[PDB]
Amino acid sequence: SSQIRQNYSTEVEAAVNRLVNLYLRASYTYLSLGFYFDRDDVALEGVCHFFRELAEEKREGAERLLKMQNQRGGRALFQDLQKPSQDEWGTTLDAMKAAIVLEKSLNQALLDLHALGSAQADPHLCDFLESHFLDEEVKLIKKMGDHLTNIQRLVGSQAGLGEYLFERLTLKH
Amino acid sequence: SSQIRQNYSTEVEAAVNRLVNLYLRASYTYLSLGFYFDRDDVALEGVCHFFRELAEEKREGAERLLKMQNQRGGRALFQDLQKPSQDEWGTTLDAMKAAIVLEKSLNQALLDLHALGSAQADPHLCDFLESHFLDEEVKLIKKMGDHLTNIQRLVGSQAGLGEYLFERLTLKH
Amino acid sequence: SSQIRQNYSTEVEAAVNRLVNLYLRASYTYLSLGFYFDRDDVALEGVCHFFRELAEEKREGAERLLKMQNQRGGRALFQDLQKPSQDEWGTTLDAMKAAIVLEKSLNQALLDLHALGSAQADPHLCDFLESHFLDEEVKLIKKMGDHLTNIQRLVGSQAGLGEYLFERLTLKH
Amino acid sequence: SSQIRQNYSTEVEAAVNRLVNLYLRASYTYLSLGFYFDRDDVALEGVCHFFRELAEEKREGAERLLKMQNQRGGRALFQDLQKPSQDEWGTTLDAMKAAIVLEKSLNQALLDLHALGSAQADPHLCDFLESHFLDEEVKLIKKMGDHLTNIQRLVGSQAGLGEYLFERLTLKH
Amino acid sequence: SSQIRQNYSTEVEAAVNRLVNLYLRASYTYLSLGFYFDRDDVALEGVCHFFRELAEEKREGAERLLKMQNQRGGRALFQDLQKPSQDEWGTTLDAMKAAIVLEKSLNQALLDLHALGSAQADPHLCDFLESHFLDEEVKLIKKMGDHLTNIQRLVGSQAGLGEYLFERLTLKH
Amino acid sequence: SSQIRQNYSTEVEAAVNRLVNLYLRASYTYLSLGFYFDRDDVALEGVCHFFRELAEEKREGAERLLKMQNQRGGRALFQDLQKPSQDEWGTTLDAMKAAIVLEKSLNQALLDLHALGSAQADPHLCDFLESHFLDEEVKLIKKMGDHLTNIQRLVGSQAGLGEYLFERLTLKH
């Protein structure tokens, strides 16, 4: 019954709300990853920095979705935020593997929403996703795949040495 | 079994984790309040801005707690984040009343943690709370009490007129 | 019945009001000391300047207490201000002795209020006192003890000569 | 028995001391008015600012009188300072009415002292009053009369609305 | 019999003197650690730099204690300074382990003094410790725990390689 | 068995270590002298400043010796540091007399080491001492002799007056 709402299905509105939840969940995951790498018994500052910056990015993603929801005349609805999947994240390798799984999950959710927008004939949504989300996920996933490759080549017969060098020479300088 | 951990009780560690949850919960509440006031059918930009800035502040509070947890050798543990208490926040008056209830809840939690720190003889915790949290809450609650008073004097026989003027002349310029 | 007031006892509120009175009293004392040293028959400009700056500092102390009273939701209550204890302040030595007695009185009052805050479990008050008052009094009392020592070493067989040199070479340049 | 004192009657000296007391009393009144408008349940920052600036001005008035007293070879004598006439100041209208009563009292005291100076043939006193006091009081009283007029036109069928708008649009920007 | 001394127990005064000795001892230890890593047969400039900066910090700590002792009217008393516990400090790992033991000893001494200040009801001492000492020790110990973790992950099957890389890539750049 | 060590006798190495101890001892003495003159019952800031700057200079002397020890391939060895010879230093005159005794002791130790270097045919040591130590001691002793002369001419029939004037007009401006 919005005065402005036009060509904006209830189905898309609902899916946008679910995606917001997924992005806040991802932000929460990165916050946890960040503080894990900041533990005195883990102490990989560059890895902490990588994940803390991702927490911010995911939060910004959610906020961008919510703004758009309002611009189209939809109603934000928030749900419980489930805690991250792990309390301890193991090695940089383990963490980066978990990060790529997470981003692929987000990406597929974006792709699903794009498909719904296409089916509903909502070119504004499709443009919005294209402009602000799809390329960002692709670039991020490529960068994470890059990191994983480099971590894997390093962590050979001397795993600790490799983990230190990656953090020192690839991450946060 | 931390190498650094010293004079840091398990009781304080647990309470710090609970407080982090409370601050993230509060951040989530403010995010919801913010986007509500950004709805086209509510449209009070200064009120949105007030709450969005509080969402950031509460998040920063949580992150400060987590950093300290790590500095003392404690282990961050994250739990589910419950969604805000309302989906719609009514008038600016209603929102500001809900905001003060929330901040008083946070404040009492800080005071409870201070008391636990005192009982455990943990002067670092007590100083940390004093320095970064207690004064901030007091100042915020005073400002919110100030706003509530002004909202109440305005929303007299002409409520809409008063709500508009408060947003225009007190909030976000 | 304040909307904001939290963990703020009536006992602390009352003691804060008494302390305000003590600080304004002290300001009044310094105003009198200042103008005494400005008399044409006393004429010690550096001593006048020392006390006039203390009058301002004590006033600022009172105003800081009152602001805090409001921040906590207490009610300022003002009482009569008793005039300074002397109309004429004698030598610089006499004045500086009277000044140290006065500051020790203020200091003990601050310490008493801190103890009351501790008993009432009011860590905000305790932090407030610690931050803005306790160190300031200690530094001031040390400086006054320093001055007294130097005045005393000077005012030997030639008291007037010593009083002039102290004012000229230690005070207000 | 002053070396400098010339054409300075004991009557004028005494009256100057009384006037100092009146100006410090007025300063004290404004301090109280200021902190009242800073209460969380009153919260009119521009009104607080108006009165706090008047407290400073009245204090400066007293100090100017005392300096002059010394310049003429008179002796400052301080008396008890009576507390302000009210603990709570009601509306901005009530406060501004009380402020004008107070300033008229000061003004009449200045006029009385001028008349005494004239009778004693003390042109220095008369010039001093003229230069630093009489015009200042006239300008202040006019400004307060201006404010009262505007408050009165505002506080019509909607008193709270009027009090808010006056504070926002006339006072402290 | 000090003119200024107020609320400053003999017990606290004595404990402050002991703590000064402990901090100068620690400074002396770091001086020794520094010059060890500067030996031509050890030659780890970044490790030398880390310890030389700690020697300065500990000295500054002692001087801060002594200044405070004087501010409160206590009397500094100096005792013999015992030489460091080792003449040769082994590996960077060994040194960093010894450094953390030392800082924990200092920290516990600060905590003991805080407890004594609390028992004696000396809020100035408690604030002083809180402000200038407790947080500094916590931050330092965390940083040392961080370093130890990184040293340990490096010094794997190739200890010399790890010691070189840590000095080059973590310390003094 | 050093790789670099050349023309550096064990006798010189040992004497260098003893001299380091003497210079650190002297630093410790000056630290004590400094804080004595900072007592509220002594309060001669310029005298405190003179000795605190000497504490730093002596420390720097020791560190210069240690660096050189390493440059030549010798091994620093640290011993206990004996506390200063007095707990209270009396007048500025007494202190300055004690200071000159101390510096003459250091100077003679430098001269003894130079003689040992000459006997051992160690021109690098002799140059090092000449360059960085011998002239510095001579200049310092001359300055102290200058001060003593001026203190003595002042502290005549009015000792306190003289001590104040020296501190004010010769020392730390």
Ligand SMILES: [Ar]
């Ligand atoms: Ar993840």
Ligand SMILES: [Ar]
């Ligand atoms: Ar709320």
Ligand SMILES: [Ar]
């Ligand atoms: Ar006084």
Ligand SMILES: [Ar]
């Ligand atoms: Ar008034």
Ligand SMILES: [Ar]
């Ligand atoms: Ar150590």
Ligand SMILES: [Ar]
């Ligand atoms: Ar000495």
